DNA sequence: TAACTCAATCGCGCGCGATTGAGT
DNA sequence: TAACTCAATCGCGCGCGATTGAGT
C-alpha cells in the first residue's frame, strides 16, 4: 500500500514539474514566437547540425508522428530546412537555417537572464525505461 | 559561469520531460484495463481522497482548470465513474461525485498498478523530497 | 516479386492562453 | 446598470498507438 503511495506522489510530481518547466520556457521564447519541444529540437541541433529527423528522435525519445507536423511548423517560421537524402531518398535531412544557428544566442540569454537533482532524475528515468519493457 | 548554469538547466528540463512522459506511459499501460487516462487517473485520485468536489477544487488541487477538466469530467461520466451535477444554492458551480462503481474500483485499479513496481521501492524518499524542492523552486520562478 | 525501413498520416486526449456567456 | 465568479468553449500544439505508402 505504502509504495503505491509513493509512486503517486512521485509520478504526480514528475507531472507538475515538466508543466512548470514547459510554463516557464514558453514564456521567455514567446519573443521568438517557439514552443517548448520546438526548442529541445533546436537545443539538439545547436549542439549537431545537420541531422535525419529519427536522429533527433532518437536524442528525444520521439518519432515522425511528432517530428513530422512540428519540423514542418519550423522550417515554416525559417528556422531550419527539411529536405531529402540523394543517398537514400526515405530519409529526411534537417538543416538549421543562418537565422536559425543565429539566433542562439539570443535565445539561450532570454532565459538565462531569468535564472544532485540531475543524477536523481536520470536514475528513475533508466527505472522507468526498464519498466516499460519487462 | 555565463553557460555552464543553462546546460545544467537544460539536461534537467530535458529529463524532467523525459520522466513525466514515462511515467504515462507506464500509468497507461496498467490502466488500459479500465479504460483511463494517466490524467483521469490523477482526477481518480483526488476523488477517493476527497468526495464530493467542485471542479474548480479538483483544478485547484492539480494546477488545472475547466479548460481541460470539462472535457475530461464529461469523459469519465461517459465511462460510468463520475456524475457531474450542478449546485442549487449556486448554479455557476458543478459538483463532480463518484459513481458507486467509481468508488468501488479504487483497490482494483491500484492492484494493477502496484503488482508491477519493482521491489526496489523504503530507498526512495530522497527523490520525492528532491522533486517537491525543484517543484516548489519553479512556482516561484513563473510569479 | 519480397522484406525492410523510413516519413507521413490518422485519431484522440490532453494542457493551456484566451474568450464567452451564464449566473450571483 | 455594474463588478464578480464560475464552467464551458475555442484554437493550437503536442505525444503517441496505430496505419499508410513511398522508396530500398
Known sequence: ?????????????????????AQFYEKKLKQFGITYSQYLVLLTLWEENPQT???????????????????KRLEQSGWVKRERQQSDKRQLIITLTDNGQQQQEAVFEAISSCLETKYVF????????????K
Open 53 to 71: 529527423l529519427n536522429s533527433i528522435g532518437r536524442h528525444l525519445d520521439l518519432s515522425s508522428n511528432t517530428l513530422t507536423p512540428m519540423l
Open 122 to 133: 536520470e536514475e528513475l528515468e533508466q527505472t522507468l525505461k526498464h519498466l516499460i519493457e
Open 1 to 21: 500500500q505504502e509504495q503505491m503511495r509513493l509512486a503517486n506522489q512521485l509520478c504526480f510530481s514528475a507531472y507538475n514539474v515538466s508543466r512548470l518547466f
